[PDB]
Symmetry: C3
Subunit: 306 residues, 3 copies
């Protein structure tokens, strides 16, 4: 099996410095050797250098770096599309979660029936009209869902984007910090999610069983796993931009990834929002990067029983 | 929906200095803004000043500060009774857990059919004849339960207390540090409880289901939630006087509070035993205070999915 | 009603210094008083001094200290056999896990129909032909299981060992760091195990139920509990030689011990691999030793509900 690794050192989906160093931190934590050890044939695309945009002024005096985020995601989408074309499962290292616009667009280009597992403390589904931060890393899903497009105005640099996913084709796992307009969107478009509360009730084994019944119970589909490291409790993943108490345990995160691998359908994976600069110690930065590597490795077959 | 907040800075139910600063620490952690944000209309009664009793000698050369605990609880009960009659759900901030004598007596004064959910590492059900510490914060339930009163002698300053509640009307959640005479009492009077072991077996969802079926399965009753911060594992709630390893997780504490809110019946809440002076660091004190606010907020409707 | 305590301060099953101070550390954390309070009549054999072997060269240029480990276990087996013969449940404090060769051989010498519950992050079932470390604490099970013996060469100092326990008579709980040859052995011999993943799926209550169904579902048998402290998550048991992320919680460990007690069949217990020199602080050392005392005390009747 063949896996392409793409560093996407992007930070302009939000305002905190340092998430552009996530890809190097994850690499420094041993990613490539771990993937090789599993039998993965590897193509390293390196870290992309995204084309800047001069005078990328706020959109509507709120939305930050719109043209830079639109253009970086267009370029990323091109690399993901071509790698998925050439037979690779695509691992994209971030970088902030606005990059999911690019990886899911590029993925869907060649696999239009793909489904999405979004593992995250946050829903990332604000629109340009509901965001209260202006940060695109909290809006990427709104640009991707067919059913929402009449409520998403067109941003400078975003005209290449055509939503390719139905709201029935994404499931969230781990929600615990949702804005009211996001909650409204989830309920109003009947988007399925398992919050931390649902995990407390069902247990992660049932959560995964129901996730796959919703997504692939009728038919096999390529799976896009978009994993925000802040889905994990901050005690485990402290080096990240928007930590929220009461997250996944280590064991729960491994279990999610093991179940992803067990479908045999994993086609692309994002590992986003590792920001080593927000660690208060080198150890905090390395434990976060090591946890990122554990997620990716388990998603491609690393087991706890050997 | 109206919420009264009462500071009860009492420490004479036990011997460790500093729990009288519990109410200020909780207020400082942002309680009042959190309750407003949920839509609660608030009346802050401030921090009560309890009348001292001169020459409050030990009772039976063992029980410490009996008259002061008795009189402070008499005064607290009056405030609680008044706030309930004016339509407020009553939040009392402690302070050591002997204040539940006052809040439950005042609550039961005009709601004699109330039920009690007692969240705690301890049963607090020693009598003056079984306590080996002499600390009234470890005896409050013995004064409240009608079936026990033939076995509870009359302490100086306690004559105003009339046990209003049946032993079928209290459920414990989180027990893990129980004296042999307390275990006898729980068994002998058939008092229902879910120890940490029961949570390990059943899961917190079923624990709450069985709690409400036992208490409100046949009729709606105002709920008194007496929440001792030491129900949480000491890694989460270190700033407290009697910590015991193996406690509730954060998620379990939130889930309890969420289910309390979901009944619609919460009528009074005690948040006791936060002692900021027992934290070894400012960060330990503040995480303990912040956890207290999360419990209260979740008990009045804060959710994890927005 | 009677418990023997044997200190086995052995370190030559592995290469890290200090695990020979496990027994003293566990005793200093209050083991004997805790056992007495449960009503255990106690015989303390102290710490054994094992006979050295001159010129104990590597076996096959790989296996370290073979004769010293063999002889020390022969001597330990003799002490365990006598204690079990005289009516004592035998508690052996390690020391590295190669001592289970001695404690299980000595136990079986008096109770041949014993069964084994092996709580560990590791399977410890490498043979001299599969070990990649050469450390005998990672091989003890291979010397004990009847079905494996054609694949186990005879080591100098090991000829006294009579391996008559069946592979159907051991169950593992907690596995998460298993070598590929150990995985092959476990599958090829149909040895039953509950990995951390199984615990994630089933919950520790069902794990224990199924463990006892496999071992004592048809008849009562004396139970040998061999408990490697590194089964627990490293955050709870840091002072140990091979820590592995994602282990048992405190509550899961207590629950295992409680169910061991509840069978009424506990006949011997090993508490191994506490190495206080690997703690980065005195706090980490004492937390690990206190956890070891909790495991042993719970295995002999300490409950969380009193
Ligand atoms: N919804 C947000 C947005 O900016 O839209 C607001 N903020 C959450 C929090 C909610 C209430 C307290 C103040 N802020 C983060 C989130 C983006 C997460 C992006 B990611 O990729 O890490 O998930
Ligand atoms: N049972 C106690 C009492 O004093 O009666 C004794 N002590 C428990 C513990 C038992 C093991 C040996 C050391 N002591 C705490 C408890 C009071 C807790 C009051 B609270 O409001 O925090 O719950
Ligand atoms: N299988 C081992 C052996 O030495 O045989 C290899 N080693 C850990 C090794 C490190 C990284 C690669 C995979 N695992 C520990 C185990 C022995 C544990 C003995 B015990 O009593 O602590 O359980
Ligand atoms: Mn995200
Ligand atoms: Mn997030
Ligand atoms: Mn209490
Ligand atoms: Mn308590
Ligand atoms: Mn081990
Ligand atoms: Mn071991």
């Amino acid at each position: 099996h063949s896996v392409a690794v793409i560093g996407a050192p992007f930070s302009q989906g939000q305002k905190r410095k340092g998430v552009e160093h996530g890809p190097a931190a994850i690499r420094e934590a041993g990613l490539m050797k771990r993937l090789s050890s599993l039998g993965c044939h590897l193509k390293d695309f390196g870290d992309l250098s995204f084309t800047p945009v001069p005078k990328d002024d706020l959109y509507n005096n709120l939305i930050v770096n719109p043209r830079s985020v639109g253009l970086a995601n267009q370029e990323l989408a091109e690399v993901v599309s071509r790698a998925v074309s050439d037979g690779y499962s695509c691992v994209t290292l971030g970088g902030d979660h606005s990059l999911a616009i690019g990886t899911i667009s590029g993925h869907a280009r060649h696999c239009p029936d793909l489904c999405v597992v979004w593992v995250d403390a946050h829903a990332d589904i604000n629109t340009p009209l509901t965001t209260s931060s202006g940060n695109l890393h909290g809006q990427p899903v709104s640009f991707l869902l067919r059913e929402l497009q009449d409520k998403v105005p067109q941003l400078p640099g975003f005209s290449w984007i055509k939503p390719c996913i139905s709201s029935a084709s994404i499931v969230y796992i781990g929600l615990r910090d949702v804005d009211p307009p996001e909650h409204f969107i989830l309920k109003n478009y009947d988007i399925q999610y398992f919050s931390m509360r649902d995990i407390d009730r069902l247990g992660i084994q049932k959560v995964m069983e129901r996730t796959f019944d919703l997504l692939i119970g009728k038919r096999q589909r390529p799976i896009h796993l978009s994993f925000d490291i802040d889905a994990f409790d901050p005690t485990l993943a402290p080096a990240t931009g928007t930590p929220v108490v009461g997250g996944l345990t280590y064991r729960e995160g491994m279990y999610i990834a093991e179940e992803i691998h067990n479908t045999g359908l994993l086609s692309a994976l994002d590992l986003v929002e590792v920001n080593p600069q927000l660690a208060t110690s080198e150890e905090e930065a390395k434990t976060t990067a090591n946890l990122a590597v554990d997620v990716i490795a388990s998603s491609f077959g690393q087991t706890r029983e050997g």
